[PDB]
Write a protein that binds this ligand. Structure first.
Ligand code: GTP
Ligand code: GTP
Ligand code: GTP
Ligand code: ATP
Ligand code: ATP
Ligand code: ATP
Ligand code: CTP
Ligand code: CTP
Ligand code: CTP
Ligand code: CTP
Ligand code: CL
Ligand code: CL
Ligand code: CL
Ligand code: MG
Ligand code: MG
Ligand code: MG
Ligand code: MG
Ligand code: MG
Ligand code: MG
Ligand code: MG
Lengths: 247, 247, 62, 247
């Protein structure tokens, strides 16, 4: 046989490169996944991830309450946090024993897989009673925020898209919903009559995940990296795997 | 009057038979329900049922965490099970006090009503972090598993469809989503422009149920039988009611 | 060892101790107890008996 | 064939009678069990049974503490009962919040299987610090109490032997050990050199049982009767099964 890495007959090498390229491209076909992650960062350094993985389109919607830190199996001042919520839903509406709940997210990162079309991304960032813009009557139910998404890049390849906003102020109390649509450069509408019942099924087949990690380190080591997910850390460092035409 | 059960003028008899047949056929009309059940069997003999009942199409999607046994109002080692989850999401990722959680499902049965079209059934059996096939990039978001569904039969009639798989191994840690579409032998697409907003409404009108029963016996006696639901028990015994052209 | 003594006991943790008393009553006699479970996870799933090589195998009794 | 119950060719009848007789006689062979039960009766009506079943000989030995009522999974005033014990071991030796512990046995019944030789029965009824007769120096380690054992009889057959004594007085605080030897009318000593290592093994193979029942009724219905054990109840009623030469 030819010697490795010196000719076009390194079929092992060509197969490796094809294998990587097929994975990148399959994801971006209409048969592939689109995925979104919402990261809520808490003052204790822990991070709630909510992830959803579906075909065609994908999104996540969470109440203000559901974005609040919840420590499984530990104390959470649960009565006092009920009172906190009443005071967030309406000024002076509760009887809490604290000015600022440490369970409130300090920041939010939204990440989409590279199979999303950035121009289809939509966010509904509502207030604490789930109203997008002060009052329902004058609320557009979403904003198209794709232009604010930064490319997460590794080896020159787009491994994902990130939108990050901090909630460092007392009045940054939010409900949040975000959505995007899987890339489709064809003129085959996946939601046309031919395939629309398959999209309705995708609503039911979408797989969801949530967990609270103790630190950004733990998230990078045990959630992002093992699953070849994209991420952007607090120091602006990109994580992900470059696959297109690479060994 | 004629004597009962000796002539075609037993209108009570004809009405009984029609009543049963109308029920069977109504269910399979486009106006009828389609229903899915997911049964998770635990090592203590208890069973979580999740059921959903909707028009047009129906499905259920659950995280690994949500499929785990939860004993309402009792102790559940809740802190230790948080640690268990961390070690299931990533090898050696947690600090649990046990090798195998008894809260993990030992098996799963999926049952569909006989109004489903078996060829439209789709399952997303993901790993514990909700990825259908090792990595998102190479994951088809579902498998069409209809061919593995056995007919649940009573008196020669198909009363339902069952797919059962055990999870007897340590590495059988899953998230799970399943979907099917109501029979439609017509060329009227329920998702065509004429009726598609009604299908979107069906998403909101779908009625859901979950409960943990203490034993398969309790499930058969108080869930399956009273509601005329189909079921297949551990001894391969079929439950359901035969209605088509029967008194 | 008694049936009770072979049952899993987690030192220093919760063991559903009242419910397992009821479990035992239902194991000693069918329908003899009021337990909140069909099968106790504290029951052994298997048993291995090992003897040192200094045993005479023909004297073993169970 | 001959008609049932009218001739010596009712082999089913002869086999039934033999089956019963073989069971009675096997028990009394040197290959059979000998068994002892100690019942401690508490003021709340509950009963602790300790049973042991062995070949050749059998016995039970329990501390004063171990004979005290213990309610599994409930409160037992455990600290106060530690103090109670100190005051029972020595007058005014503790700091208990009660004059008389309801956990102390009100009575004791000792029952032996009919395979015992009544003349080999021995009891060590000690005081609360486990001394048979006031002081060790003058204590015979046992009394032969066989003459006080009443025959428990059913259908004319001895189904067992019972010795009962109440402990209705404040000073009736006891430790207790009892022993008996399996009938042996032969001149083959089971403890002779030929078979003595088998008797040492019987020490290890003896099967033990203890449980607290809530009432004498529960004991009769769920312990005595199902296992064909002998018993004598508070109204002097005999329980057991007559087997010798009976259908
Ligand atoms: N392309 C390139 N990579 C470099 C260079 N110097 C160091 N590297 C490192 O080598 C890696 C890429 O190496 P290769 O994959 O073998 O080069 P390539 O550009 O992909 O060439 P092909 O294998 O033909 O596709 C990068 O991740 C770089 O960090 C350089 O001068 N050019
Ligand atoms: N069909 C049929 N049923 C039997 C037979 N023997 C016993 N059965 C029982 O009877 C039940 C069906 O009885 P029917 O409903 O009166 O018979 P059928 O075949 O439905 O006849 P129709 O009432 O005219 O529809 C079944 O569930 C059987 O368990 C038999 O030879 N033929
Ligand atoms: N022996 C006997 N039993 C009676 C008499 N009257 C009623 N019985 C009842 O019948 C039962 C015994 O009946 P059997 O076993 O058929 O009589 P038996 O004395 O054992 O005679 P065999 O069967 O030959 O051993 C007892 O439990 C009694 O309660 C009677 O006059 N003599
Ligand atoms: N030293 C180099 N000189 C020239 N080209 C390089 C060099 N290193 C890498 N490249 C190539 O240039 C392209 C971009 O790689 P690069 O590492 O700069 O991008 P990145 O990882 O997305 O961003 P960054 O490394 O700046 O954080 C890749 O094809 C890479 O192989
Ligand atoms: N003994 C019989 N002989 C002939 N036909 C019967 C008999 N019993 C029932 N049938 C008819 O045959 C058809 C099938 O009934 P059957 O009870 O065999 O099916 P099932 O209940 O779905 O399966 P199974 O009883 O084997 O678990 C029905 O129409 C029934 O009325
Ligand atoms: N009515 C009877 N007349 C004569 N013999 C009887 C009668 N009833 C039973 N027997 C026989 O007499 C023997 C003793 O039976 P019996 O029921 O009197 O004893 P037990 O059950 O040990 O004591 P008890 O019934 O007095 O509590 C048995 O062989 C029985 O079959
Ligand atoms: N604003 C508040 C906060 C708390 N409490 C009382 O203090 C108790 C304990 O506080 P809680 O908020 O319940 O927190 P923990 O019990 O410590 O934690 P958790 O409930 O999550 O286990 C509550 O039951 C409540 O009765 C109160 O009077 N009003
Ligand atoms: N791996 C573990 C498991 C438990 N614990 C500690 O033991 C306590 C009790 O165990 P837990 O898991 O909370 O179970 P329970 O309290 O018995 O049951 P539940 O929480 O469901 O009421 C926990 O609060 C936790 O502090 C721990 O140190 N680390
Ligand atoms: N069949 C049962 C099971 C439990 N309980 C009640 O629920 C309480 C708590 O359950 P238990 O069996 O005692 O378990 P834990 O307290 O959680 O654990 P442990 O006793 O081992 O500390 C008990 O005290 C008992 O009063 C009951 O009513 N009947
Ligand atoms: N003579 C006694 C009796 C009790 N106590 C105190 O009261 C508490 C509760 O009583 P206890 O005897 O422990 O009974 P319970 O806790 O009610 O029941 P259990 O311990 O069996 O669960 C004890 O911890 C002990 O500190 C005491 O000071 N001295
Ligand atoms: Cl495609
Ligand atoms: Cl229709
Ligand atoms: Cl013998
Ligand atoms: Mg706890
Ligand atoms: Mg609280
Ligand atoms: Mg780089
Ligand atoms: Mg049948
Ligand atoms: Mg308890
Ligand atoms: Mg106490
Ligand atoms: Mg009698």
């Amino acid at each position: 046989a030819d010697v490795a890495g010196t000719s076009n007959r390194d079929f092992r090498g060509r197969e490796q490169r094809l294998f990587n390229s097929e994975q990148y491209n399959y994801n971006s076909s209409l048969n592939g996944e689109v995925s979104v992650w919402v990261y809520a960062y808490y003052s204790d350094g822990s991070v709630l991830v909510i992830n959803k993985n579906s075909q065609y389109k994908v999104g996540i919607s969470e109440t203000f309450k559901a974005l609040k830190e919840y420590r499984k199996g530990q104390h959470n001042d649960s009565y006092d946090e009920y009172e906190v919520n009443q005071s967030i839903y309406y000024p002076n509406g509760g009887d809490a024993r604290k000015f600022h709940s440490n369970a409130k997210p300090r920041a939010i990162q939204i990440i989409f897989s590279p199979s999303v079309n950035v121009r289809t991304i939509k966010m509904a960032k509502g207030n604490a009673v789930s109203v997008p813009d002060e009052y329902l009557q004058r609320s557009h139910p979403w904003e198209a925020t794709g232009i604010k998404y930064r490319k997460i890049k590794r080896d020159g390849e787009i491994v994902g898209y990130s939108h990050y906003f901090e909630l460092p102020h007392e009045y940054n109390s939010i409900s949040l919903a975000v959505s995007g649509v899987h890339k489709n450069p064809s003129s085959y509408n996946v939601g046309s009559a031919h395939n629309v019942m398959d999209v309705f099924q995708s609503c039911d087949l979408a797989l969801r995940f949530c967990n609270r990690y103790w630190a950004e380190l733990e998230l990078v080591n045990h959630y992002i990296s093992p699953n070849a997910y994209p991420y952007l850390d607090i120091n602006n460092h990109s994580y992900g795997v470059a696959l297109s035409n690479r060994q």
